Amino acid sequence: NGGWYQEVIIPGGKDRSVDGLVWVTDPDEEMADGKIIHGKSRLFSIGYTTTITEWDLEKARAKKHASGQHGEIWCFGVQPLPAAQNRKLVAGTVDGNLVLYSIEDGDLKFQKTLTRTPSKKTKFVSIAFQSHNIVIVGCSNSTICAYDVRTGTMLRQMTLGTDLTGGSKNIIVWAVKCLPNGDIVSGDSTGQVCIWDGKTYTQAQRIQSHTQDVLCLSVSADGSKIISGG
Amino acid sequence: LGYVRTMRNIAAKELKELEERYVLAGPKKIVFFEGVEERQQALEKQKARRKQLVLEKLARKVKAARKKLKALADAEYELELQQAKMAKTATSGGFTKSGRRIKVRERKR
Amino acid sequence: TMERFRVSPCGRYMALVASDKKGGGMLNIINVGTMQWIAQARIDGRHGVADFAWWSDGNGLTIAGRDGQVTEWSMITRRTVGIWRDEGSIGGTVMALGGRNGPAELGGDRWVAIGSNSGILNVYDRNDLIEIRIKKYPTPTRVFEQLTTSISVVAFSPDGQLLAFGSQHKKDALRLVHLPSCTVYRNWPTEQTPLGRVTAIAFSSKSDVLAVGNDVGRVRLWEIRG
Amino acid sequence: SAAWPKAEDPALVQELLDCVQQASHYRQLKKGANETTKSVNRGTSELVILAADTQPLSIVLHIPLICEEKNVPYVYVPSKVALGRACGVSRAVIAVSLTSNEASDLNSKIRALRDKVERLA
Amino acid sequence: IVEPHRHKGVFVARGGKEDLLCTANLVPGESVYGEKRISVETPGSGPDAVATKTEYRIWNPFRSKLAAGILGGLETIYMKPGSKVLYLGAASGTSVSHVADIVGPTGAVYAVEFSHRSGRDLINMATRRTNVIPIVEDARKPMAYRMLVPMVDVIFADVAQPDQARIVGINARLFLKQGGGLLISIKASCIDSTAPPEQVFASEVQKLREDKFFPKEQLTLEPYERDHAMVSCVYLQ
Amino acid sequence: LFILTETSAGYALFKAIKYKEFAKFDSAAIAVEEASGILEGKVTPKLASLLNELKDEKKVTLAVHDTKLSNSITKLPGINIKPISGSMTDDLFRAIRQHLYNLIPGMEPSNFDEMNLGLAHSLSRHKLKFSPE
Amino acid sequence: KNPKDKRVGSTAYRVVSNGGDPRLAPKAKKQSLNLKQALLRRDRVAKPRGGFFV
RNA sequence: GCACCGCGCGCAGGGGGGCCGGCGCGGCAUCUGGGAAGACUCCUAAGGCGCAAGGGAAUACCCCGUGCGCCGGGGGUUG
């Protein structure tokens, strides 16, 4: 409540880094007598590897490792709630192929691969979910693809022009996030922030703020404030 | 064109048969081990003309068949290009005798 | 560059296509009387914006971009209303948009013509465009495969009855189509009608005079009586 | 449905149709279901593209059988009309099959394109 | 002249320019898929000189990854006459028929296929060969034939699925014996179409080791096919 | 600890290390009706006659390993005893199917592989007429 | 590290190696790390590092 | 083994290392070069191309003006 006390330090070994951190929190389950059981929260992490590691917070170590045949993972996110007992991690990686992992009853195994982009040089650098079945991935060929999880299809492909500030003609969408009212915020490499309306997946505003590239975003819970760090 | 097509089909079946027979005549394999001691045990266990004539013969036969199939393929392509040059309209394809490539962007209406 | 641009029939806005392709083309909208940038509409394609047109009441604009996509993007909410695809056009090249009495929410322009690079010109009805939602695969009122080479210039009548479309790369590629019947006029142009290599066409304001200008640099005039 | 190696990415469809148009200019192409069948049976076809908007799908569903028997890649693009006026026909083609030769930039493009088709698989 | 090969139940036919592989025919006087067959008899029939006793079906390497591996230099196939093998990927009943010939009348083959036309071929081959039973069911769902399949000795696997290691893992946990055998074929083209195939095969064999096999050896089929591996491994020993 | 083992012919029970009882069945198309009945988890006369004891539930234990069958025979109220799913009952079910050669003279000193074969061909042709020709 | 593989010429004898990551964490891939670092600094050059030093 | 008044020398290979330098493979925001390349662009010219014949020749290569076609330039009033 404003104390900010660092509880626990779990260090990893030499030559190990950490890129993403995603908690998964189950819904509030009810007991037989009306008592409430809050969700059991688990911690997943990627380490610039082809592996997702689930950490045991009680044991103060890693619990499981999971590895599918793909590229090294760069970004990932949990499917949010609509179903209840069936929520899945979606991970975008370097070679492009959206791998999809399952987590049920405390298990972490590589379920399948949704798609892969046609170009091999397409690298997936961000991911955020619009709804229960629609994933928004930010791709280093100046691209923001909107895929659909159920059939694994490609709803649309929003795009951005070149950067006209310097050379290096590809822009890079370093982060995306989703507002509550369906719209998608996207921090890119021009130091812009692009608001895309999500009923049609198009751009509706470009805002130039930073001088160098945007690196991360955050949304208000109701969807009124946008924080952009670059 | 029809005659060259038939001869190419025959030559393709013969080339398939001959490559099969030649392969049948004549870091690839890897053996895994749990430890260096077991690998050294395996190395200890390891330390403890007519086929050439028939292989050179089949190789020469395969090379002749390949050359024949390539010649028939180039002939079939040349005849398709002659059809394209002599078609009833401006049809793309094939080089002229001057070197410029015939290329028309009209749609065959 | 500032080459391709179009002024709204309301005369308040003017649109410029940016030269920034990268798989997706944008165009800036400028208030005319002050010549100031007011908005920017961006569509996704493969080389950018082929062509576009203001709507008849001048509130939105329709952008036909290559790889066959078409976006209707309005001025009021200043975001994309809808997106559809021309039926199998391997790449758009030019578009035009005219007529009266259409969908009042899409600007009230009844007919939209899209000419691809294959020579095929599709003519769609913009009441049939509506399923605000847009049908992703609308069916053309009529597909024209008369011209053989890439469609260069398209213009409607200001009265919304005639549609002239012409290809330049062949000597005399020009046809004239009555609307809403969508039938090609067969008695003109004849084999000896001195068009040339039709580079630009223009109908007069009362739709009485058709003006055609060829690549040699001569302009010719035809009265259009019925 | 039965169109499981489907090509849905619009950049992928654009690359495939650009390659088909180029090969059609080089006359390295076979247009139509029956000529596709003959080219695949004679084994010359480097890659084969089908159309998913055929109204009876069974009139083209036979091609993947011989394609699996002969180990040649096949891919479904959406629109038969798009495939048609990409070939340059003004008729709706439903199955096109583009072959290889000794040496061409189109041969290198075909190798890259079948690499992308294998990615799709 | 026919000689027995080092593996039990498989034979070579040697001639002046050739060396074919063959198996003893369980159904005498009949072939299946347009295959050559040799007729021979044991010595002791000089005054007659008729080839009447043994019939050998010829085993073409260009249609079977198993034949490819055996020629490539597999040191054992883990199966002998008498064994029990589970076949995943009964691609139109060819190698399944030959392993039925290998295991003989006392050995049993249980084939698994999900394709319906190869299923037609498999049932119409199983009409004749009775040591083999067919299952037209997706191999990722082993509890749809757990009732049908008893405990087996060797799992052979050639299926074109990305999760081939998981299919083999679930079938090994529900049917494979302790210290069992697994001959798996890897298709790098179906697993990962961009990576180097050595890397793909390394990832697959690591997945099997995590799946609690013990990889004995790996040999690739590249005088015969392209980017195909054959891994021989033991289960829990 | 009641277990429920499903082979092509019948069932066995090993509550009291060693087997206790069994239920055999041979040579009918009612076997493939039983096969569909367990491919869903529905009612079965053989299953009900196996689970029919007369006193009470002395312990509410029936170990099965497919949860669909488990949560169907829960809903079957004829005896109101309850199963457990396979909480890695791999050693149990795998070891008894491997070591079922000791089970053979206990119930059926023979080989029912021919009935197994007939059931397999019946099921497979049922699916290939589900995809008819 | 892991022992290198001995080749007798036709086959390759090698020891399988999994003793690196027991339960701590997997090792980070240096090539992917440098790749992301390059996409961060595409064409920029660093400012001079410190104060007065050779 | 050479020297028993010695270092060092020829030779078999067991293991790890400087990961010093080359080779192979992979990626690489860019940059350079080549091809392909938009159909407003080039498309070589007001003419060119193709096929089958005929003649001549440095005799592998080529050139030239008969019969069929395919385009193009100019000119060209609802045929």
Curated annotation (Swiss-Prot), chain B:
Belongs to the UTP11 family. It comes from Chaetomium thermophilum (strain DSM 1495 / CBS 144.50 / IMI 039719) (Thermochaetoides thermophila). It is found in: Nucleus, Nucleolus. The lineage of its organism: Eukaryota, Fungi, Dikarya, Ascomycota, Pezizomycotina. The gene is UTP11. Involved in nucleolar processing of pre-18S ribosomal RNA. Residues 36-48 have a biased composition (Basic and acidic residues). Coiled coil: none annotated. Residues 88-109 are annotated as: Disordered. Component of the ribosomal small subunit (SSU) processome composed of at least 40 protein subunits and snoRNA U3. Interacts with snoRNA U3. Residues 98-109 have a biased composition (Basic residues). This is U3 small nucleolar RNA-associated protein 11.
